[PDB]
């Protein structure tokens, strides 16, 4: 429930002289992906430990 739905998202084209925009766009996508991967994996490890202690 706390992880939302992924909605349509596609990439963008950039020109030869728009490399700075291309790099920022990529930076943003990689940054968000690295953060959500971290959050998803950490939450699972934390809850798996508690589940076993609970039982």
């Amino acid at each position: 429930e706390k992880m939302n739905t992924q909605f349509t998202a596609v990439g963008k084209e950039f020109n030869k002289l728009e490399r700075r925009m291309e790099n920022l766009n990529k930076k943003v996508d990689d940054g968000f992906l690295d953060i959500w991967t971290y959050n998803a994996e950490l939450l699972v490890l934390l809850e798996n430990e508690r589940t076993l202690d609970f039982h």
């Binding site: 596609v10 963008k12 084209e13 950039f14 020109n15 728009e18």
Partner: peptide
């Protein structure tokens, strides 16, 4: 403005 058109047609 090809790239902007491609974005608008998306």
């Amino acid at each position: 403005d090809y790239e902007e058109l491609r974005e608008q047609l998306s």
